Nucleic acid binder design. Structure first.
Ligand code: DTP
Ligand code: SF4
Ligand code: MG
Ligand code: MG
Lengths: 206, 422, 168
DNA sequence: ATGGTCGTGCCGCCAATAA
């Protein structure tokens, strides 16, 4: 069974024979958002669950109900706060030295890189990776200007995890892009299931 | 049964006519809007506030003081009204807080008017499990309670009753060492019980609102309820007459664009550019243009942050305040006719050209155009003579034999129309 | 093994980089055949073709056919080499088939054969789980070494820069 | 210091010509 999304983007089950005409199946991915390092582990796990459900041998009716239930559970758990902090991390690699970036203000990872260079010990250079998490500061700036280090959250008090960003820009796009070729699921339905406001994504006509 | 204040649970099961369905929603909206005015213009303790709010509650047939038995009708009215209004104000997060704040204020008012002695039964009628203490018990613990009292001045233990509550429900109080705790039971004055009642009501109200929003797509399937769920937040040169100009001076294209903006609360890019440049042409400045666009987009149930970071840049650039700082001329009618043909979901373009006669006929009809003029305009359109047809439209809607000018620009249309109208 | 294949200094191998190994390999190849090499220095062409997909979900069986060592096979097949192909964005013409094999395909054949040798050992039954991963890493490294010989033909700072060969 | 092709998320910028 194969789900082909776009160019260089497909998930599939590979048939591995064992003996006497018996064969097992192994899940493989190529190009999806689940294999990249610039997405949170939460979105990758939810997308992996959705891929596993879609490619199964069950009827098309049951998979939609299972996805709905699991998405509702994720929506409740994210606001409840039962998911550990380590699953909210986004990892990005640096190409040039942190001091050399002219657009330092608008990029989160370089903003964290200058901090970790300026106060910490080991200095991050070109080729190294930086982990950042988007949190609530209360200064009313944009999301890309509110990046903080993983150790900057458990030490200070005024910062808290921004659930809106991770629930409307991290989880929703992945599951919306995955379920595009399948019917019965749409962006507004996922928005309602996750507990978001449908007004932003598509809606419009009354 | 105490129909003068009620925690809203157990949704009803009666059936009603649709006219009453809309009337209840509009009456509840009116009352809840006036609560805003009363709470803003006055302060929470004046007699005038109480008098005005109770007079308005009397006006709209809503429940108040319990001393006159069978007001079953106001009870039913309020019970249905709250649940019918729950569906509308649960969509956007800017409306849920607005609903909760004013409903809590209304419940505070309704609580303050209970006479003195029907409060006890009510507390049991809302699943709260509270208790009172007799006079001998009050005298036994008088010194202990007055010592445990908050910064409330005086040792005089007045006639205000002292209530007995499970300790876990008084978290906001015993945390600050402001009450008396004995055998796992907290003793509170009557003044502070309002805070805990409202705080416990708020959580249940928010939970009910959330659980209704996610199971609300199933209710949109009904075609008779669409207007209600989407139009309860609907509704030299100034802002408060543009609509009138839409009927009077605008050409059919720009009138169509204004109607689209009024109805759908959104527009595509071509219509945005065209209408914005024309609206600059008539004489608006930057401040009221931003006011107009943001007011027309907030009614689309989007918060101001999205508008500010999405469309404000383009709106400002249209007037020439960013970039090369170049001020633009409104689109000439030729480019409206020939450039950027419209598609599905778009309302821009010239109606006399892009719209088929099978639609242009009723487009003229809806604008009180005479059938002879309709036939003449259709004949002109069939002959690919658009500008003279638009001129004939101007003459017919202006009741003149000849306009006296050659039309090539909608701003010229508007200026010529205003020359004679004003 | 990589240093014994390319012939460079072992210390330079551990610092990474793929241009230096190819430079020394081609230098040895050309010096062995009595040549003169260019002196040291003191997108740009059409690439692969990707077909238009048919987006959606498929329940039935799908075959996938793949070519083994495509670009080295092309080089060996059409005798693509410095000596055999004329040059000066234009695609040169294929050379005459009568001429003997050039320097480049003979050297890339050895890398292909080494990879095929490693895969045969990988085919064996009842192998230790760590040994199979070590062999996989070895064959991946050899494949990258073989496929970097084509890439070095389009590097503007390489000692053997030749755009038309990669274009062809 | 190997080549090219493909998609996803942030920003700023532009069209226009009556009277
Ligand atoms: N890292 C790379 N550098 C340069 N060229 C590459 C690279 N990866 C792939 N190519 C080019 C050259 C290859 O002939 C072609 C196809 O590569 P690929 O499908 O991965 O394997 P391959 O066709 O060489 O055979 P194999 O399946 O035996 O590994 O793409
Ligand atoms: S002729 Fe010009 S002004 Fe008249 S309706 Fe068409 S586009 Fe508008
Ligand atoms: Mg847009
Ligand atoms: Mg291959």
């Amino acid at each position: 069974s194969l789900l082909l999304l776009k160019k260089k983007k497909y998930a599939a089950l590979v048939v591995e024979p064992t003996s006497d005409g018996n064969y097992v199946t192994k899940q493989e991915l190529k190009g999806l958002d689940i294999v990249r390092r610039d997405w949170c582990d939460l979105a990758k796990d939810t997308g992996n669950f959705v891929i596993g459900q879609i490619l199964s041998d069950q009827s098309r009716d049951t998979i939609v109900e299972n996805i709905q239930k699991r998405l509702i559970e994720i929506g409740e758990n994210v606001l409840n706060g039962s998911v550990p902090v380590s699953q909210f991390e986004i990892n990005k690699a640096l190409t040039k030295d942190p001091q050399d970036y002219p657009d330092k203000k608008s990029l989160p990872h370089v903003h964290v890189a200058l901090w970790i260079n300026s106060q910490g010990g080991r200095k991050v250079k070109a080729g190294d990776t930086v982990s950042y998490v988007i949190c609530q500061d209360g200064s009313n700036l944009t999301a890309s200007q509110r990046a903080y280090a993983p150790e900057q959250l458990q030490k200070q008090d005024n910062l808290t995890i921004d659930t809106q960003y991770y629930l409307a820009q991290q989880i929703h796009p992945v599951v919306a892009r995955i379920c595009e070729p399948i019917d019965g699921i749409d962006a507004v339905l996922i928005a309602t299931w996750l507990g978001l406001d449908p007004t932003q994504f598509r809606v419009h006509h009354y | 049964y105490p129909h003068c204040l009620q925690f809203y649970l157990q949704p009803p099961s009666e059936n009603i006519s649709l006219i009453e369905f809309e009337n209840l929603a509009i009456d509840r909206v009116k009352l809840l809007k006036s609560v805003e005015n009363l709470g803003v213009s006055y302060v929470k303790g004046t007699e005038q506030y109480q008098s005005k709010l109770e007079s308005e509650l009397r006006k709209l047939k809503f429940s108040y003081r319990e001393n006159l038995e069978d007001e079953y009708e106001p009870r039913r009215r309020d019970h249905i009204s709250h649940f019918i209004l729950r569906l509308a104000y649960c969509q956007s997060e800017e409306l849920r807080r607005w609903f909760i704040q004013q409903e809590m204020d209304l419940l505070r008012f309704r609580f303050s008017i209970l006479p003195k002695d029907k409060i006890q039964d009510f507390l049991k009628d809302s699943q709260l499990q509270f208790e009172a203490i007799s006079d001998e018990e009050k005298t036994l613990r008088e010194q202990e309670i007055v010592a445990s009292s908050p910064s409330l001045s005086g040792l005089k233990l007045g006639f205000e009753s002292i209530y007995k509550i499970p300790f876990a429900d008084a978290l906001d109080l015993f945390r600050g060492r402001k009450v008396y705790l004995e055998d796992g039971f907290a003793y509170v004055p009557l003044k502070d019980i309002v805070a805990i009642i409202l705080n416990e009501f708020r959580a249940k109200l928010s939970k009910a609102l959330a659980l209704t929003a996610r199971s609300l797509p199933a209710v949109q399937s009904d075609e008779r309820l669409q207007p209600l769920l989407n139009h309860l937040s609907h509704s030299k040169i100034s802002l408060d007459q543009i609509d009138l100009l839409s009927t009077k001076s605008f050409p059919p294209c720009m009138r169509q664009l204004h109607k689209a903006l009024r109805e759908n609360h959104h527009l595509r890019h071509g219509g945005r550019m065209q209408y914005g440049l024309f609206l600059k042409g008539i004489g608006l400045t930057l401040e009221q243009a931003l006011q107009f666009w943001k007011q027309e987009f907030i009614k689309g149930k989007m918060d101001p942050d999205k508008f500010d970071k999405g469309y404000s840049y383009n709106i400002r650039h249209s007037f020439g305040k960013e970039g090369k700082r170049t001020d633009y001329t409104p689109f000439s009618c030729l480019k409206i006719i020939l450039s950027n043909p419209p598609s599905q979901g778009d309302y821009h373009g010239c109606p006399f050209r892009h719209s088929d006669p099978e639609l242009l006929k009723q487009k003229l009809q809806s604008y009180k155009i005479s059938p002879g003029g309709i036939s003449q305009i259709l004949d002109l359109v069939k002959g690919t003579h658009y500008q003279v047809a638009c001129q004939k439209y101007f003459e017919m809607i202006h009741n003149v034999d000849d306009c006296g000018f050659s039309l090539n620009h909608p701003n010229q249309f508007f200026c010529e129309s205003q020359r004679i109208l004003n | 093994q990589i240093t014994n294949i390319a012939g460079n200094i072992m210390s330079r191998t551990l610092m990474g980089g793929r241009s230096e190994r190819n430079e020394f390999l081609l230098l040895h190849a050309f010096y062995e055949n009595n040549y003169i090499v260019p002196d040291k220095q003191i997108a740009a062409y059409a690439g692969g073709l990707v077909l238009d997909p048919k987006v959606g979900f498929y329940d039935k069986f799908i075959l996938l056919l793949d070519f083994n060592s495509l670009y080295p096979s092309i080089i060996q097949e059409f005798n693509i080499c410095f000596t055999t192909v004329q040059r000066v964005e234009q695609i040169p013409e294929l050379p005459d088939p009568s001429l003997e094999m050039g320097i480049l395909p003979r050297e890339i054949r050895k890398l292909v054969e080494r990879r095929k040798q490693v895969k045969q050992l990988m085919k064996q039954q009842d192998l230790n789980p760590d040994l199979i991963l070590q062999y996989d890493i070895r064959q991946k490294a050899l494949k990258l070494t073989a496929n970097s010989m084509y890439g070095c033909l389009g590097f503007s700072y390489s000692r053997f820069y030749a755009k038309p060969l990669a274009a062809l």
